[PDB]
Structures are given as C-alpha cells and as structure tokens.
C-alpha cells in the first residue's frame, strides 16, 4: 500500500509527485515511538495526578492515574467488565495504580 506525495502551487493546481510504499505484517516485534528516546535502557513513562493519554499493556484511553497500595495478589491488569482499566500493578514491584476518568 502507499502514501501519494502531492504538490501544489498555493492549492490551485494539484499534481502527484511520487509515493511512499510500505509493507507490513501484524504482530508485536516492532513498536513506533513518538520521539528519539535516548540514554534510557528500558523505555516507559508514567505521569500522575492529572489527565493523560495512556497506553498501558495495550489498554488505550485517557484519565488520571494515582498511586496506591493494596494486597492485590494475582496478575497485573485490572479491568471493568466493559474492558476499561481500573488499575494496574507495576510488574517489577507491588505498587499499584488506580485509573479514573477525569
């Protein structure tokens, strides 16, 4: 599939210049990143206490994340029966985070 490259002179005339071609297959080996992160050995980001957009273990949405601590024995993802994050446990440790819709 492709992305046509178009040219115009002040949006009067329009013509195609060329195109960018891309192939792909679905899966989870390669991830796009918003900017050229450097220095960091393992990439993640977490903002607390006011609205964010998040991508957390493939759950995507918006809201406010706050830290807490409860004896949540079990896995690392907690969701509603509508598929929305209620919270998550930060894998390497026992800290848990609560996710709310601002």
């Amino acid at each position: 599939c492709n992305f046509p490259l178009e040219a115009t002179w002040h949006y009067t005339s329009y013509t195609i210049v060329g195109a960018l071609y891309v192939t792909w297959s679905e899966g989870n080996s390669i991830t796009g990143v918003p900017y050229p992160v450097s220095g960091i050995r393992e990439f993640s980001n977490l903002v607390l206490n006011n609205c964010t957009k998040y991508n957390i273990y493939d759950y995507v949405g918006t809201g406010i994340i706050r830290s807490s601590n409860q004896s949540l024995a079990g896995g690392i993802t907690y969701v509603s029966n509508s598929g929305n994050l209620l919270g998550f446990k930060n894998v390497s440790t026992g800290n848990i985070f609560i996710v709310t819709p601002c």
Binding site: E26, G27, N28, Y57, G74, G75, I76, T77
Partner: peptide
Amino acid sequence: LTNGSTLVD
C-alpha cells in the same frame, strides 16, 4: 507458547 500476542490475565 505463542506465535504472536500473549495473554496476561
């Protein structure tokens, strides 16, 4: 084992 995605919970 998987061939792609993984289950978490």
